[PDB]
DNA sequence: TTTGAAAAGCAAGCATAAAAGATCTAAACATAAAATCTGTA
DNA sequence: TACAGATTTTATGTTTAGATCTTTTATGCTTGCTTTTCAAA
């Protein structure tokens, strides 16, 4: 515990950066910590992740499923959804965008394909994802004049899709789901530029989540315009057992 | 301009042009050095303003014509909107770069202590060298937000301090995009890494005019340190 | 497994309106249809005028660029507040090819690449307008010998506040060398979003003297005299007039949020107005009665919640102290002419008085709060019309069901949330997010992230992770952990690990390591050393 | 104090750029002209940190030192006493 | 009203993290002559 | 059968994006001595 006077605001920030004397520093490591193997960590972790606080999470998820028509109404008006909160938002976005959103859009326009991105995976790439966007939306290929002089073909092709899709009917052809938009390979500038120019296209629905507490530093005013986010807090204290396998936990 | 001036108001005009060129040379040779091109540019910029002050008294009098247009020979004259959050974030960035973090609590702290504890004592000495002359230091985001909240202008359910919402981080992202602030890396920058540090990227003459546009007293924070 | 991929396509197996039933599930479906349709007529009526305003913005800006461009040095144009999206077009003028060459900082790693891309664009345009060449400035030298026409080059430097200034300086010095050719004229367009002096002190003084021979300035930004904001808001006032009125707190919310955005405040204004209209047509059941033909569709719930108005409160209290459906349906005909009065004082303000540097949103806010006179006591040229332009708002009855107001805190949660503050408040006061319904364990012990955050908030510079784990153990109770860990006899590994005498410390270490790396992923905590992993630094503080 | 026109900071910038161009100052730890075209190409595809900071903070080193300036500036020059430290 | 004493401050030492960049290498982008395929005449 | 034309194979050049390693410089902890502001006589 800190021997502080303040805890909140800059008052607790400046007051908690004390220059602690070297005589009052404890030399404690993991050497006298308990020795734990991998399998018992996995067993205890899955047991509390499937039993501890499970009834309040189930109840709370039963409240926040009532927000699904409001989310759909936000998506039809051109707003991208960004979800944030404490805990895993993987299962929420899968259930909303698969069980609910695609059948509702498909029946209202008379299923809709759902690309699902895993930003917790460090090997998520913009060129592979855009080749699949090409595979799903079949855009027209760039002319020689449209390639300029060693330009990025992905960005120029998406800009050509932007000034193609402005005169198409405004109906959702693709639902594009981004788990963990602020993970390691997905937070970089080119991939965010790609999704901003994709979010300009009204005919693609953008559903994304973030996990980092400093994540809104990723977007300047142009990118914030292009995303056009409506923010929604979904805090549920989930396990996050899928993303945790992509980091090393035994270290 | 001279041909319109002499009808509105060859050798004598040649003497007038030569005297103007000699006056330009003696006024700005220390500025230009022995540069033909810079003096040519100065002659081009100052000749019509010199011609416009020629009257029927000044034309045959070099000293009177020089006294009519002396302000052309006293200054070189070689010269040619931003948000409140972004201005105050620039001021906080300049404070974070050019002041030490250990003396923050002696400058910005103002809260009444329920719990007993001494605050910072402040610095004993004054620096020999102005820190604003040197390179800026590198800071963290949380320190910048803390000083921004400490310097931003202002019951039971009000909480008049401004917290770091979407707009603060968005203005910070524009502030980096314009490179009014900079980082250690510029290519393939990871915004979310804790190892990435930030510095201010404006000189003192820019941050002074920005602080004059918002009536902030930034020079008070450097008058008592050096 | 799909969870271990990077990206995958799912086609869900399928077996019509997102609006829901209001009045506690008693709203009829025809009212839902009317709400959806009427929201769509209001939304379409707003965005048609928004689209015409936007095309007028680009058309007028193109006109003034073409005016400033065509009426031995560069023709320099400094576009302040550019946020470059303009598609500049040039004249189809005979005996001279006019080529627009656009350059970005991504296309500018050095001078050689800038020249090569410029000459490739020049040759491509000159071939498309009517043997291979070298992509250097000698193509500019021999342009009349290869195409028979003069050359007019207009360089559009996009996002000059991002380009390297030494490279741009050397490219301008390179372009100066084409001034010895009689068939070439060069225009430069610099797209600035910071200031003129910022680029003036990152260029050498000889280049500044070069650019000073022929230069013009022009403001581009969306807050140029407010007239493009003032149209759009009035378009909203041309959409909602006679239907709903704006609240003063909603208008000052608009003013504060547009004062916080520099380059793009028009689209932020449109987004806030759209989301307010969405919230109204999704929340209120009285929005069917905006159409004046639905007045026969009143029920008991509509009158039951109709009587709970502060205006109806004051009215019936006054009539009781003096001495329902027909009273309601007749009082829906008044027009609320504050919008017409605001448009009238605007057209009076730039009709003859030549006052054009005003914000119509400020005027409408001061007209709403009754302090209009304090608003027009600033210009000192309209002193003669303090009674001609005077207006007193009339507080009508039951207008609080027909209004756009910001009091529930919905706009500031959906459009501009306190993101990191919300994260740390849900971490620290978790009982707020989680229901208060492992029956004996959930009442006693918090979720591990919340307990770990409460121990985290009360710590210093450097946290020793072993002692922090001990502080996490002492919060946990051993007895009901050992009771609940034996409440599943199917898994025998859990029972035999529970039988071990070091079970509680081990389980606490499982939960502690899981929660620590949860905080490390979220960014709250940091290992300062790449190896060892014996100490941590706090990154974030609550309430900043 | 013991009258020379004191030039402003906005005018000494031109004199400073002339002094940099005349090889009197060099940028601190600058390689300069590379030996071969491959290293020069590699240097051309990289933006150095000196060209991104403002000009009044750039570090320079001297091509001539104060002792040589004292040696070859004449005695009757009125800035001569400043050549000693 | 003093007192003093633990909190704060300053400087030297030194191991170490990190900025800058030198050198290079893969990947996208790009062109091209000879051979091979291919759809008819 | 054959042939004009389209496509592939093999071969190389152009430009951008990122990795790795080295060298020099900021930084952060330690230790000893000096100031100093607020919890008790």
UniProtKB/Swiss-Prot annotation, chain A:
- Provide the GO MF annotations for this entry: chromatin binding; DNA replication origin binding
In Gene Ontology terms, what is a biological process of this protein?
A: silent mating-type cassette heterochromatin formation
- Protein's cellular compartments: Nucleus
Task: Supply the alphabetized keyword list.
Answer: DNA replication, Nucleus, Phosphoprotein
Report the principal subcellular site.
Answer: nucleus
Kinase keyword on record:
no
User: How is this protein annotated for GO cellular component?
Assistant: chromosome, telomeric region; DNA replication preinitiation complex; nuclear origin of replication recognition complex; nuclear pre-replicative complex; nucleoplasm; nucleus
**Similarity-based family:** Belongs to the ORC2 family.
Per UniProt, subunit arrangement is: Component of the origin recognition complex (ORC) composed of at least ORC1, ORC2, ORC3, ORC4, ORC5 and ORC6. Interacts with MCM10 and TAH11.
Function in brief? Component of the origin recognition complex (ORC) that binds origins of replication. It has a role in both chromosomal replication and mating type transcriptional silencing. Binds to the ARS consensus sequence (ACS) of origins of replication.
Other information: Present with 1700 molecules/cell in log phase SD medium.
**Name listed for the protein in its UniProt record:** Origin recognition complex subunit 2
Q: Supply the source organism for this entry.
A: Saccharomyces cerevisiae (strain ATCC 204508 / S288c)
The residues of the intact protein that this chain contains are 234 to 497 of 620
Curated annotation (Swiss-Prot), chain B:
User: What GO cellular component entries does it have?
Assistant: Cul8-RING ubiquitin ligase complex; DNA replication preinitiation complex; nuclear origin of replication recognition complex; nuclear pre-replicative complex; nucleoplasm; nucleus
Molecular function terms, GO-annotated: ATP binding; DNA replication origin binding
Is ATP-binding found in the keyword set? yes
Q: Which cysteines are joined by disulfide bonds?
A: none
Q: Which GO terms describe its biological process?
A: DNA replication initiation; pre-replicative complex assembly involved in nuclear cell cycle DNA replication; regulation of DNA replication; silent mating-type cassette heterochromatin formation
| Keywords, alphabetical | ATP-binding, DNA replication, Nucleotide-binding, Nucleus
- The primary location reported for this protein is nucleus
Superkingdom to which the source organism belongs: Eukaryota
The subcellular localization recorded is:
Nucleus
Oligomeric state and partners? Answer: Component of the origin recognition complex (ORC) composed of at least ORC1, ORC2, ORC3, ORC4, ORC5 and ORC6. Interacts with ORC6. Component of a cullin-RING ligase (CRL)-like complex composed of at least the cullin RTT101, a linker protein MMS1, and the potential substrate receptor ORC5. Interacts with RTT101 and MMS1.
An additional note in the Swiss-Prot or TrEMBL entry is: Present with 768 molecules/cell in log phase SD medium.
In which family does this protein belong, per the annotation?
Belongs to the ORC5 family.
Q: What's this protein's name?
A: Origin recognition complex subunit 5
Give the species this sequence originates from: Saccharomyces cerevisiae (strain ATCC 204508 / S288c)
UniProtKB/Swiss-Prot annotation, chain C:
Q: Give the primary localization class.
A: nucleus
Q: Which UniProt keywords apply?
A: Acetylation, DNA replication, DNA-binding, Nucleus
List the record's Gene Ontology CC terms alphabetically.
DNA replication preinitiation complex; nuclear origin of replication recognition complex; nuclear pre-replicative complex; nucleoplasm; nucleus
Q: Which GO terms describe its biological process?
A: DNA replication initiation; pre-replicative complex assembly involved in nuclear cell cycle DNA replication; silent mating-type cassette heterochromatin formation
Q: Indicate where this protein resides in the cell.
A: Nucleus
GO molecular function terms here?
chromatin binding; DNA replication origin binding
Does the entry feature the keyword Endoplasmic reticulum, yes or no? no
Which InterPro entries does the entry mention?
Answer: EF_Hand_1_Ca_BS (IPR018247), ORC3 (IPR020795), ORC3_N (IPR045667), ORC_WH_C (IPR040855)
Record's subunit section: Component of the origin recognition complex (ORC) composed of at least ORC1, ORC2, ORC3, ORC4, ORC5 and ORC6. Interacts with ORC6.
Its annotated function is as follows: Component of the origin recognition complex (ORC) that binds origins of replication. It has a role in both chromosomal replication and mating type transcriptional silencing. Binds to the ARS consensus sequence (ACS) of origins of replication.
What does the similarity note say? Belongs to the ORC3 family.
Kindly provide the name given to this protein in its UniProt entry: Origin recognition complex subunit 3
From Swiss-Prot, chain D:
The signal peptide, as residue positions, is: none
Where does the protein end up? Nucleus
* Transmembrane regions listed in the UniProt entry: none
Question: Could you tell me the superkingdom of the organism this chain comes from?
Answer: Eukaryota
Provide the assembly information: Component of the origin recognition complex (ORC) composed of at least ORC1, ORC2, ORC3, ORC4, ORC5 and ORC6.
Task: Say what the protein does.
Answer: Component of the origin recognition complex (ORC) that binds origins of replication. It has a role in both chromosomal replication and mating type transcriptional silencing. Binds to the ARS consensus sequence (ACS) of origins of replication.
Q: What else is known?
A: Present with 2170 molecules/cell in log phase SD medium.
Q: Which family does it belong to?
A: Belongs to the ORC4 family.
The molecule here is called Origin recognition complex subunit 4
Per the UniProt record, the lineage of the source organism begins with: Eukaryota, Fungi, Dikarya, Ascomycota, Saccharomycotina
Q: Which residues of the full protein are shown?
A: 424 to 529 of 529
């Amino acid at each position: 515990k800190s021997a502080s006077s303040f805890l909140d605001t800059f008052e607790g920030y400046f007051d908690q950066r004390k220059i602690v004397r070297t005589n009052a520093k404890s030399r404690h490591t993991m050497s006298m910590a308990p020795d734990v193997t991998r399998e018992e960590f996995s067993l205890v972790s899955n047991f509390f992740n499937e039993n501890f606080q499970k009834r309040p999470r189930q109840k709370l998820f039963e409240i926040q499923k009532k927000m699904f028509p409001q989310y759909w109404f936000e998506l039809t008006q051109g707003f991208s959804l960004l979800f944030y909160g404490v805990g895993s938002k993987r299962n929420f976005l899968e259930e909303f965008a698969i069980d609910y959103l695609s059948p509702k859009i498909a029946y209202s326009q008379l299923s809709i394909p759902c690309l699902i991105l895993n930003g917790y995976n460090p090997s998520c790439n913009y060129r592979d994802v855009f080749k699949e966007i090409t595979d799903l939306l079949v855009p027209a290929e760039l002319t020689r004049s449209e390639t300029k002089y060693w330009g990025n073909h992905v960005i120029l092709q998406i800009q050509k899709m932007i000034d193609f899709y402005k005169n198409q009917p405004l109906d959702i052809k693709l639902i594009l789901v981004v788990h963990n938009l602020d993970g390691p390979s997905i937070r970089k500038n080119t991939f965010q530029t790609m999704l901003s120019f994709l979010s300009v296209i009204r005919q693609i629905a953008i559903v994304a989540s973030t996990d980092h507490i400093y994540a809104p530093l990723l977007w300047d005013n142009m990118k914030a315009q292009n995303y056009n986010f409506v923010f929604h807090d979904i805090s549920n204290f989930e396990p996050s057992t899928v993303e945790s396998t992509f980091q090393d936990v035994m270290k | 301009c001279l041909r319109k001036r002499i009808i509105e108001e060859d050798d004598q005009f040649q003497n007038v042009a030569a005297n103007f060129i000699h006056l330009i040379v003696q006024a700005f040779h220390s500025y230009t050095g022995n540069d033909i091109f810079a003096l040519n540019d100065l002659i081009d910029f100052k000749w019509p303003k010199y011609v416009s002050r020629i009257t029927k008294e000044n034309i045959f009098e070099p000293l009177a014509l020089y006294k009519s247009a002396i302000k052309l020979f006293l200054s070189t004259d070689d010269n040619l909107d931003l948000s409140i959050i972004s201005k105050y974030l620039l001021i906080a960035s300049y404070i974070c770069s050019y002041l030490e973090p250990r003396y923050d609590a002696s400058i910005f702290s103002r809260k009444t202590r329920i719990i007993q504890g001494r605050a910072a004592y402040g610095r004993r000495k004054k620096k020999e060298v102005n820190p604003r002359y040197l390179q800026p230091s590198l800071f963290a985001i949380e320190r910048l937000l803390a000083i921004f909240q400490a310097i931003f202008p202002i019951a039971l359910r009000e909480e008049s301090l401004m917290k770091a919402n979407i707009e603060v981080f968005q203005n910070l992202s524009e502030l980096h995009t314009l490179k009014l602030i900079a980082t250690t890396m510029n290519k393939n920058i990871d915004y979310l890494s804790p190892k990435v540090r930030w510095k201010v990227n404006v000189p003192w003459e820019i941050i002074k005019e920005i602080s004059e546009s918002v009536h902030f007293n930034i020079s008070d924070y450097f008058s008592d340190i050096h | 497994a799909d969870a271990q991929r990077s990206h995958y396509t799912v086609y869900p197996s399928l077996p019509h309106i997102p609006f829901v039933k209001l009045l506690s599930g008693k709203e009829s479906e025809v009212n839902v249809e009317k709400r959806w349709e009427l929201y769509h007529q209001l939304h379409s009526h707003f965005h048609d005028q928004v689209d015409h305003i936007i095309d007028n913005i680009e058309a007028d800006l193109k006109a003034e660029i073409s005016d400033l461009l065509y009426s031995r040095c560069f023709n320099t144009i400094f576009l302040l507040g550019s946020d470059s999206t303009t598609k500049i077009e040039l004249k189809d003028e005979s005996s001279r090819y006019n080529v627009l060459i656009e350059l970005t900082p991504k296309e500018s790693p050095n001078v050689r690449m800038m020249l090569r891309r410029s000459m490739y664009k020049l040759y491509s345009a000159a071939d498309a307008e009517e043997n291979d060449v070298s992509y250097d400035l000698s193509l500019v030298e021999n342009f009349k010998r290869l195409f028979g026409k003069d050359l007019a080059m207009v360089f559009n430097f996009k996002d000059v506040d991002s380009i390297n200034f030494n490279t741009l300086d050397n490219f301008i010095i390179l372009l100066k060398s084409a001034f010895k050719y009689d068939h070439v004229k060069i225009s430069l367009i610099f797209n600035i979003n910071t200031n003129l002096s910022n680029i003036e002190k990152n260029l050498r003084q000889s280049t500044i003297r070069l650019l000073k021979r022929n230069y013009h300035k022009l403001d581009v930004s969306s807050n140029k005299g407010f007239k493009y904001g003032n149209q759009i808001f009035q378009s909203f006032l041309d959409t909602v007039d006679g239907k709903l009125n704006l609240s003063d707190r909603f208008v000052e919310f608009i003013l504060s949020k547009m004062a916080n955005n520099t380059n793009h405040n028009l689209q932020l204004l449109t987004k806030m107005l759209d989301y307010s209209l969405m919230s109204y047509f999704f929340q209120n059941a009285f929005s069917v009665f905006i159409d004046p033909v639905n007045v026969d569709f009143l029920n008991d719930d509509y009158l039951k919640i109709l009587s709970r108005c502060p205006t109806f409160m004051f009215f019936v209290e006054g009539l009781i102290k003096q001495h329902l459906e027909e009273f309601f349906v007749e009082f829906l005909v008044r027009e609320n002419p504050i919008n017409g009065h605001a448009k009238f004082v605007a057209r009076f303000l730039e009709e003859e008085l030549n006052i054009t540097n005003f914000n119509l949103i400020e005027l409408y806010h001061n007209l709403l709060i009754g302090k209009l006179d304090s608003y027009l006591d600033r210009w000192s040229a309209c002193k003669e019309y303090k009674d001609r332009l005077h207006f007193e708002p009339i507080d009508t009855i039951f207008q609080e069901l027909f209004t756009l107001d910001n009091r529930s805190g919905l706009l500031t949660q959906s459009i501009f949330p306190s993101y990191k503050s919300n994260i740390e408040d849900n971490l620290l006061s978790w009982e707020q997010v989680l229901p208060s319904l492992s029956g004996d364990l959930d009442k006693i012990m918090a979720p591990v992230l919340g307990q770990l955050f409460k121990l985290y908030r009360e710590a210093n510079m450097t946290i020793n992770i072993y002692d922090f784990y001990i502080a996490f153990r002492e919060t946990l109770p051993k007895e009901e952990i050992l009771n609940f860990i034996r409440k599943d006899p199917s898994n025998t590994k859990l029972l035999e690990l529970a039988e071990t005498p070091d079970a509680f410390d081990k389980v606490a270490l499982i939960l502690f390591m899981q929660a620590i790396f949860a905080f490390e992923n979220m960014g709250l905590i940091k290992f300062q050393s790449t190896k060892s992993y014996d100490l941590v630094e706090k990154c974030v503080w609550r309430g900043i | 104090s013991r009258t020379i026109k004191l030039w402003l900071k906005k005018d000494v910038k031109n004199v400073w750029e002339n002094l940099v161009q005349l090889d009197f100052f060099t940028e601190k730890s600058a390689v300069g002209l590379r030996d071969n075209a491959t290293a020069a190409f590699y240097a051309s595809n990289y933006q150095f940190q000196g060209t991104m900071i403002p000009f009044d903070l750039r570090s320079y080193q001297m091509q001539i030192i104060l002792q040589e300036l004292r040696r070859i500036i004449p005695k009757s020059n009125m800035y001569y006493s400043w050549t000693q430290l």
